[PDB]
A paper describes a structure:
Excluding archaea and few instances of eubacteria 2–4, roughly 147 bp DNA is wrapped around an octamer of two units of histones H2A, H2B, H3 and H4, forming nucleosomes in eukaryotes 5. One exception is the gene locus LOC_Os05g38760 (MSU gene model). This gene locus encoded a previously uncharacterized histone H4-like protein that we named as H4.V. Sequence alignment indicated that H4.V resembled H4 in length (103 amino acids) with similar histone fold domains albeit with minor modifications. The histone octamers were insoluble when folded in vitro with H4.V but were soluble when the N-terminal end (53 amino acids, accounting for most of the variation) of H4.V was fused with C-terminal 50 residues of H4 (named H4.VS throughout). In order to investigate the differences brought about by the residue variations to the nucleosomes, we performed single particle cryo-EM analysis of nucleosomes reconstituted using recombinant histones with either canonical H4 or H4.VS.
With recombinant H4.VS or H4 and H2A, H2B and H3 from rice and Widom 601 nucleosome positioning DNA sequence (NPS) 47, we successfully reconstituted nucleosome core particles (NCPs). Processing of the datasets using the standard CryoSPARC workflow yielded three-dimensional maps for H4 and H4.VS containing nucleosomes at 3.6 Å resolution. This observation was consistent with the recently published 47 Arabidopsis NCP structure. DNA-octamer interaction profile within the core of the nucleosome was not drastically different between H4 and H4.VS NCPs as revealed by DNase foot-printing assay.
Residue numbers in the entry:
A (entry chain G): 25 to 103
B (entry chain H): 26 to 103
C (entry chain B), D (entry chain A): 20 to 103
E (entry chain F): 38 to 134
F (entry chain D), G (entry chain C): 65 to 152
H (entry chain E): 63 to 135
The structure:
Amino acid sequence: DNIQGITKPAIRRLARRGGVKRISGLIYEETRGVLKIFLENVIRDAVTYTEHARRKTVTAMDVVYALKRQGRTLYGFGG
Amino acid sequence: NIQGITKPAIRRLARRGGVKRISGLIYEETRGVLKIFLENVIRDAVTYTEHARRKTVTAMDVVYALKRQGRTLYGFGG
Amino acid sequence: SSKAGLQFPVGRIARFLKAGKYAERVGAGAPVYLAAVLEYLAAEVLELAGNAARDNKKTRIVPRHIQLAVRNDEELSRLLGTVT
Amino acid sequence: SSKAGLQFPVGRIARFLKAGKYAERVGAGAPVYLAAVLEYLAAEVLELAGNAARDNKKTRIVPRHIQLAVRNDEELSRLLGTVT
Amino acid sequence: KPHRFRPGTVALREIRKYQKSTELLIRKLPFQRLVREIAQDFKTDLRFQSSAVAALQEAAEAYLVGLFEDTNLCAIHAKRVTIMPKDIQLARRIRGE
Amino acid sequence: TYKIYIFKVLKQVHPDIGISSKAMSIMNSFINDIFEKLAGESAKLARYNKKPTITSREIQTSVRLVLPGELAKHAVSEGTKAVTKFTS
Amino acid sequence: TYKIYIFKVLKQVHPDIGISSKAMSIMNSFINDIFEKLAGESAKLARYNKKPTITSREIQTSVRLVLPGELAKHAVSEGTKAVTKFTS
Amino acid sequence: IRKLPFQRLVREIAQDFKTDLRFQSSAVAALQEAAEAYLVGLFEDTNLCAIHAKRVTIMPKDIQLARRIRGER
DNA sequence: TGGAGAATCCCGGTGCCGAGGCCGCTCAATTGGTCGTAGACAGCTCTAGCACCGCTTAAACGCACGTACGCGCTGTCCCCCGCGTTTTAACCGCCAAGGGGATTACTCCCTAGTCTCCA
DNA sequence: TGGAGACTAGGGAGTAATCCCCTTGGCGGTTAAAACGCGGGGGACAGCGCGTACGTGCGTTTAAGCGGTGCTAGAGCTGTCTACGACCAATTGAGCGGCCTCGGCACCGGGATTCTCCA
């Protein structure tokens, strides 16, 4: 599966960036689940914005608007 | 008058919140948090009132101040 | 509203859209769709509140019943996460 | 713009206000006030970003410097709490 | 032989009674005096409608109830039962306040 | 003030169950907030696409964005049904 | 885009400090977001009292509402100074 | 996060909502940046939760709490 | 394994005032023309997204093993809960003052609409 | 080609006054909670130990990365042009406040039933 592509080293690097020092072995499955939930919640809005404009190409602006709508505004990718 | 929020009031609020047991230092922190929240809402409410050139704060001003903070409130007009 | 088979005021909602300055022009389809969506949401919330009231053996909806209906359902709770 | 000493385009700001249908009518003072507020905020943010960059011994501004400036100041932090 | 409840049972009874009820849990007159004292700083000689004060009281009570729910969750997370200042501060810190 | 229409809807779903003044005000505030949310999102979508006319498509996209999951599905179905019945 | 004006402001505050393409885009996005916030809040303020005109007072109220604390106060001072200079 | 596996994950997730979708590289990059920022913030909050509980090893019952407090699930 | 004090609920008796229906009537919802134009549609350009496929190699993966530490156990004591007493001010009803919300009217001044020009 | 400038008229704004509604400020008085103090027990916690699992280094895949190769789907835009929506106006009826009634509910008394400790 592609979700398994987010392996242990990636989650460990993210945790080390977030301040965590020692990570339990069961964190990784929860981290993948949370990442999938977040990606679903952003992609639904992005795809809805894309379908509204009758386009088949998801662009940067759709993703930026989807993020800004979730109260997670992002800068540097247009708009 | 912040001391007017007596200990039994905070006890009742905590019991409603589902807290089984309360330390003795919660009360000062709860008063501080209540003051912070009231200041945050009242600043916006008074700003909305002062915009309309009035000296009477209305219910709509408070409701809009709550709605701008992410604490939308129903059943008081709008 | 009669032609659309709705209990909501399509004309009043159209007037609100036009006077609200949301957009320069409002197509005829928009007020009917918005009235239908509002009617469906109101019907759902009122149905949940009434079913909650029938459990509490009270025949009059009150804020407690509305709060119970909002918090017992997951979708509405997600919609009304920050609503008192 | 140059008449009031402000670098921001008062004319462009007025056009943006009118085009976006924010109001039916726009006063002659509102674009000047908005230009002043935007210019002050931009100047403050750029100054903080440059000051943060100087500690890094770099002669150019990068998104890392802007992120540091945003996360350092408390007021900008509250204004930009959820900005990446 | 006076019948005395063991420590804790009456707290749970109060929890059940209060969660079963809906009325406000803050004295109205001290809350109104507090609101006037706080609003004195932002604008001098203001006047509050009764409904505005009631709305402020309802909002404050709802906010405190939510904060105490999150504080109780934080306390249970640390295997304690007694909520403490380190539990309210964490619940505020996570929310971003 | 959507009080009369909310009352009619409640009678449609519950013929015998009434509603209090506070509950009626809560329902009215909820309807007003939902309507303002949908209208604001439709205005944002129209401005982003530069189309000055709010059509059924903008309202449909706004409903898909605001209402989650089953609520979104049923609301979109109801709106499409109402628009189809109105046009015909 | 506000790239020219942001570039000039940055050169004014820091002549010896330059800016890259990504940093300029981030600053432009921040300026656009602030402008959208202030304009939307002024529109909401106008809609609340049903006054169809946006003046310096509406912008000042929106600045007080959106910007917090000392930023709001300094922005109010800057706007008042600029409006007074312009109208004179 | 690795670029290509995350791109495949994004495409797989988008497959369900609407089949036959084509992504600009900019949109994928923005989604990856947002995912990284959200995960970093969540892990910081989880670290706070685990420090509060007299521990240094974060656990799934800490991420769950840090998301329950925010109100994400 | 039952007994005892505290606490809550069932049946029935009161009152109450707010929900529920009536009804002017007035202002807004429509329907019929009329006109200006944005959006539907067709068609053309080509930008950029998708798929193959080989060569590199850093990164993920599996194993071994030691040590930090997470969790169960235990006893000290301290400080919060339950409680009886007192004291204090929230709170209910009266009562007026009047200060400011609320139009109503009128003038007058400021901004949108139109035409011309240039950085 | 959008920003600047000048001319023109038409409607929102500021102001005055008045009307009266709601808020502020007292005052008397019954009384329901705050304040306070006194056990005591129970949970906070500080130390202890032991077994579990996580970090690190090492050897070995393996899929990411790049680059180079190709195509071609649809973004992007322009040109017609027609069905749509704004505007206006006579019409009329639906919702607004203000009148009423009455019945479902609030709350208590007497008594019955159930709950937390305890011998």
